[PDB]
């Protein structure tokens, strides 16, 4: 089962937050990170394409989010408005989709 892990769960007001993915399926097509609980066009942060090895930011990008080629997200200089839920969508080689959810709270 696809799983997402936050590290650390509780973070300071100026540190880095890293979200990792375990049990990622093989033979994929691309990734996409969203904000909240639902997959929405207007609430996308960053996406990655494996065919061209390309990374492209989305409408809800501020300049502090970075994607890595293992479905991993890095956020720097977090504030009190960055606390809550996040959603990950994985597209496979057969055009089928998978979803995962992570969470973290800032103090």
């Amino acid at each position: 089962q696809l799983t997402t892990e936050s590290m650390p769960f509780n973070v300071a007001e100026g540190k880095e937050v890293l979200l990792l993915v375990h049990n990622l399926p093989q033979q994929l097509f691309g990734y996409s990170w969203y904000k909240g609980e639902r997959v929405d066009g207007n609430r996308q942060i960053v996406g990655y394409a494996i065919g061209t090895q390309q990374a492209t930011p989305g409408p809800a990008n501020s300049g502090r989010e970075t994607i890595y080629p293992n479905a991993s997200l890095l956020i720097q200089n977090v504030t009190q408005n960055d606390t809550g839920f996040y959603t990950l969508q994985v597209i496979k080689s057969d055009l089928v989709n998978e979803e995962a959810t992570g969470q973290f709270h800032v103090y």
């Binding site: 691309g30 990734y31 996409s32 066009g41 492209t56 969508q89 057969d94 055009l95």
Partner: protein, 263 residues
């Protein structure tokens, strides 16, 4: 379960294969686990669903929901009337729309997409070429009566009547009646034709001679500026203060007293 060849639950319906069901009047479900649910609908292949009147699904995992809709190939979706999806992973959500190729989405009225990874959300618009897709579409045609040919092009909403033939051309909001030609070109105004950008400029070659007259909207070549034939002599003679030779050989328009002084 063993294959079965018999009639269905509708009137004059037929199921042929394994675990098929035909529920409409004069419907056909041939293959593996197909579903025909309306009048005069056909499902042929592997796990195909036809929910519209006179809708056809042919291939692998296709959906035909609209009236007079056609889904042909691998994982295609047709939703509206007279909408066609042909190829791999195409969806057509507009009336009288056409999606042909790989991963093309059309949601406008009378719009057409051919190629790989474009979305056309405008009316009476068209796309030919390649884009990108990583969960969401990153290059769309959102203008009305606009056409795009190439790779990685964008037209915004509210920008109508535009034509692009090139690569990496992005038209912003508030631009109408423009044409963009070439690779890595830019457009920044209405009623203009652009053949380059502010960093790289192109030359137009093999141009015929224009007409030099009072009201002539024709381009001018280098030879015409070199020679100067056909220009208004009086306008240039009073624009640049010239003392004419015939008026210099014969002393004319001179202030006599000032010539008395110096001489």
């Amino acid at each position: 379960s063993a294959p079965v060849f018999q009639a269905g639950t509708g009137t004059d319906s037929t199921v042929a294969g394994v675990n098929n069901e035909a529920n409409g009047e004069k419907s056909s479900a041939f293959g593996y686990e197909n579903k025909a649910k309306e009048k005069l609908s056909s499902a042929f292949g592997y796990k195909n669903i036809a929910n519209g009147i006179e809708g056809s699904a042919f291939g692998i995992s296709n959906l035909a929901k609209g009236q007079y809709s056609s889904a042909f190939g691998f994982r295609n979706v047709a939703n509206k009337r007279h909408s066609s999806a042909f190829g791999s992973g195409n969806e057509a959500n507009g009336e009288q729309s056409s999606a042909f190729g790989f991963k093309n989405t059309v949601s406008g009225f009378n719009s057409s997409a051919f190629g790989s990874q474009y979305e056309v959300t405008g009316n009476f618009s068209g796309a030919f070429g390649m884009g990108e897709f990583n969960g969401q579409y990153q290059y769309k045609n959102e203008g009305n009566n606009s056409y795009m040919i190439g790779n990685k092009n964008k037209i915004a909403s509210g920008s109508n009547d535009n034509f692009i033939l090139g690569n990496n051309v992005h038209i912003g909001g508030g631009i109408n009646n423009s044409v963009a030609l070439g690779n890595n070109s830019t457009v920044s105004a209405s009623n203009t034709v652009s053949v380059g950008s502010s960093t790289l400029k192109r030359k137009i070659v093999n141009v015929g001679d224009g007409a030099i007259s009072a009201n002539s909207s024709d381009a001018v070549t280098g030879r015409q500026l070199y020679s100067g034939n056909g220009i208004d002599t009086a306008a240039w003679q009073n624009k640049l203060n010239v003392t004419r030779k015939n008026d210099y050989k014969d002393a004319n328009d001179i202030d006599v007293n000032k010539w008395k002084a110096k001489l």
